[PDB]
Design an enzyme around this catalytic site. Sequence first.
Site, short mmCIF file in Angstrom:
data_model
loop_
_atom_site.label_atom_id
_atom_site.label_comp_id
_atom_site.label_asym_id
_atom_site.label_seq_id
_atom_site.Cartn_x
_atom_site.Cartn_y
_atom_site.Cartn_z
N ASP B 963 4.40 6.20 6.72
CA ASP B 963 3.06 6.77 6.76
C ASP B 963 2.02 5.82 7.31
O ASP B 963 0.95 6.27 7.75
CB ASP B 963 2.63 7.22 5.36
CG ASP B 963 3.51 8.32 4.80
OD1 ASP B 963 4.12 9.06 5.59
OD2 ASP B 963 3.59 8.46 3.56
N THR B 964 2.28 4.52 7.31
CA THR B 964 1.31 3.52 7.72
C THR B 964 1.58 2.95 9.10
O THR B 964 0.97 1.94 9.47
CB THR B 964 1.25 2.39 6.71
OG1 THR B 964 2.53 1.75 6.64
CG2 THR B 964 0.90 2.92 5.34
#
Lengths: 52, 1033, 52
Positions: B963-964
């Site tokens: 997600d990052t």
Amino acid sequence: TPFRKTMTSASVYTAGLTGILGLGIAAPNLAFSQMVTTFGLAGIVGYHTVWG
Amino acid sequence: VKPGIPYKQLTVGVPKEIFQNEKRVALSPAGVQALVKQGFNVVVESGAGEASKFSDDHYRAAGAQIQGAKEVLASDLVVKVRAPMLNPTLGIHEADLLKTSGTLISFIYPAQNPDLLNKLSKRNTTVLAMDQVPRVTIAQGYDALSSMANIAGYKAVVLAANHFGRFFTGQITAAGKVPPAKILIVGGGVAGLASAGAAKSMGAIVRGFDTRAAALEQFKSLGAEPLEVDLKESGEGQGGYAKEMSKEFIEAEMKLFAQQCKEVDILISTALIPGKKAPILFNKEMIESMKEGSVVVDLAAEAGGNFETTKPGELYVHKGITHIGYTDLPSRMATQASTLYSNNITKLLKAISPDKDNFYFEVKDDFDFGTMGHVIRGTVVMKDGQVIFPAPTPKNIPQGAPVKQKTVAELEAEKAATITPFRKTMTSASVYTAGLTGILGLGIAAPNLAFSQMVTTFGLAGIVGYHTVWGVTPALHSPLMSVTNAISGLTAVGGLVLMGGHLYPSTTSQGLAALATFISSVNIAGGFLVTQRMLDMFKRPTDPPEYNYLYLLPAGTFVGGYLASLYSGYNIEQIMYLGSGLCCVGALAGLSTQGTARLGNALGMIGVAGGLAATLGGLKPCPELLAQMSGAMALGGTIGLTIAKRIQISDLPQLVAAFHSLVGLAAVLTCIAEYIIEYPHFATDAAANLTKIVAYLGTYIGGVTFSGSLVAYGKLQGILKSAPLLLPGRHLLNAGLLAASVGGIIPFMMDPSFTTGITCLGSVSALSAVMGVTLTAAIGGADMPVVITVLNSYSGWALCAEGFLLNNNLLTIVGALIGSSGAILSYIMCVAMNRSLANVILGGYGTTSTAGGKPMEISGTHTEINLDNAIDMIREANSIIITPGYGLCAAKAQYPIADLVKMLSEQGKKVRFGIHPVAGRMPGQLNVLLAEAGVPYDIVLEMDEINHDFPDTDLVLVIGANDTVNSAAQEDPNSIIAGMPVLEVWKSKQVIVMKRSLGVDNPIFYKPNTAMLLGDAKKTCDALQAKVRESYQ
Amino acid sequence: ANHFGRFFTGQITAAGKVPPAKILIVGGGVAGLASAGAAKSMGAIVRGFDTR
């Protein structure tokens, strides 16, 4: 040597804490204790805000 | 059955090129692994690869079976570089040597090969025109003329050297300074961009301009000087190509070219209009208008040329001008040319029939803009001999209208422009008038002097606590909340004050304010023990040993000086509270440079010992109940010390949540205890009519933070569901509970009966606990690290409310420090993820930058590699940056990384770590998980100092982080994560990803430089360290 | 150049990764440093070494 760094730091802190007790011994009333508390906290605000 | 014969029954044919001045090859040995991987057989010629310096031994070892000459053409799939012509060594047209109804794929161009099209229709064969691939968005894998133009441009920029007379780089030498040479580029396309990039790498000065303004803009964005002529004629036509201009713009550009012809030293002409003759962009005397020693490159040599004098088959020195007129730039660098041809043919054969082995190559006529069937219709012109040569038109196409794609970072500058400065300073001054009337309102309800003094010491403690919590280094946020849960065991101070009786508790006030001390005494021992365990992992073994026992020298003299000082007959309590408050500030100011971390734990222990000793001496206990205080404190501290040395570090947020729940229980047990003990004093007193409002507020905050952190613990341990519970309307409910809470203050006023206060206190504790369970349940699983910090904040503010309640001066300072620390730690991650706090508590959707609907979708193709090539890919990289996620530590796989990193670092490499601040389920929860395994602190860099050397980074590994490391936060204003500041890991040369499957979607998966290792994370990482350990000794 | 059949710098575009070349500068005096600067400007990976 790495002994003297911590030794000097601990000496500064014990001098400061016995200075706080020395201000505690000569206190005549609670008004002076209140003014010492607000004086010290305003001093840390003043230290921290003018490096900014 | 499938509609087509499989690839196992499909042989391929790559015959020898019989044309003159052609050194290219059909498919190299690296091209033979592909399309045998598709299943098609491989038949090779005799010695074709040696002309491009490729061994036929390696070609036969790649999986091919070398055949004859007429036998190389008579296969099921004939492929060449040139078209089928008449062979002079063996007299036959190449269509006769091929099989009837076969396959042909080469550069044909039947617009200029119509008689060759009539010859190819005679054998009823199928033609696959490689050059007829139209400019589509999915045509990046198949563009033969583009790769040929890039090869010709690299060859031409190389041929600038060994033709010029002076160096093109330039330097400042000791015998004199050397000036650089200016280079001209005529005709701006891929060839101009390649020549400009190679010249800027060679250190030249470019002044190339083009008719298409996007070509000149892209050349200027590459760093060239896009010139501008004074001619108002449009250079573009219907799409990206050029068009027909008049003689007026031609004469203006001719005069500008004659002016610049005596300006630059190198001149490259690559201008050509496809289908017609190239315009002569250089005159007869303007070409001689350069210095003696000029270089004139004509890259439109087959289609005439852009000069008034250019023989297209030989080089010449034309009166001091190098006439670089070689006819085949593609025959000059044929090795990489054949490699690019094989790669483009691999992408084309993958696109033509994407099944396992079907060999469909279906024919579609009504086809869309960007449809692969349109590419199939444009590529196949002779279909089984029959003419599908007339290409169909595209479907309904805006043809790239929003070419300025809506990148994210500009819509906030557009949104911050309607924030016109009148309303900016109006909403500035509105805040200050609200604040000043707020402090006037607190002044109105002030009963006496001590309440105003307590407001002043609380406010200045708040400003100290705001400025010092930003002072901690961002790699030590995980000791920070452990030491604030340590300091928040000072509600034992407010428990001991109203403790009394004898060795047993007698009353029920004194009954409550004994287990207040008992449950709060877990916090002091547990927090300082787990903080001391966590600060003995950041200490490197190479760091010289700080003798930490020397801090007993201030502590013993401080506490024993208070002991001697009240033995001497004094009262030093109101200054000892100052001393403990300043030592508690110095606890959090200590851990601020990674080297003074142990100072900021010892000072906290000094402060808590001083505060407990001061509130112990300030009551002067009889020895009968001093035994009770010691027994309660010791029975708390034993449990608190025996459940802090047992836990493993990766299960820290569970005891962080438990240590919030104990403080939340202690505050409600100590507010109603003083409300019971102060009841016959409400008649003849003035401040007594607001110790009730302080007790109500403190009971409310404590009752919230008890149950909310219970729910957070039950949700962290997996026991409660990791899905949010949202059955009812959920807002009438929370507003009704909040309205009941704020309305409960008037029945607690307005009648002084002993029962009607206590039943209202029980009511507000009950409904506040139900409110906490209701809010904290419907949160989520990825929004977990918010509620830890918010519950930390409510614990601190509960301590401050209890400090107003007892008029104690240490509690307001300590509570304001803890509450400000919790608020800052919530704000850092509510700017890390780009949401708000009400956008997380109230279960909201999206973010602060998400527009309306239609999240735009992914395209592009992914690439997987196995274990043995990935590790050799590691072995030829200098700088590595590893970016872990939480799935690393949740699978116990941070240990085999800790050996890989050191064995790579001991060979000269540059292994470093990128850390996103919302990776683990607590602020900085994975700095400690890396530092347990044995990584030093100094190579673990945060996001904001590693997000600018990803350009200067060879290999970028990605482990578990999904997600990052997205780019939807940079390029889509419709996705959920738009505006979230993530790592820019796509700025590098090659990316690896360790993920257990293939495909909620992130377009870093679909890039030219991204692999995907498959398998279990621990089972992959120990294989990585195994290959390194057995491949480096 | 005009002796090596591969591109000197090499890029990873969306048609295939072009591997950069490895140049050996055997013997570094002044011309070793000059040719190494010319190759590092060209984009090659130079691994020159000398006895001095």
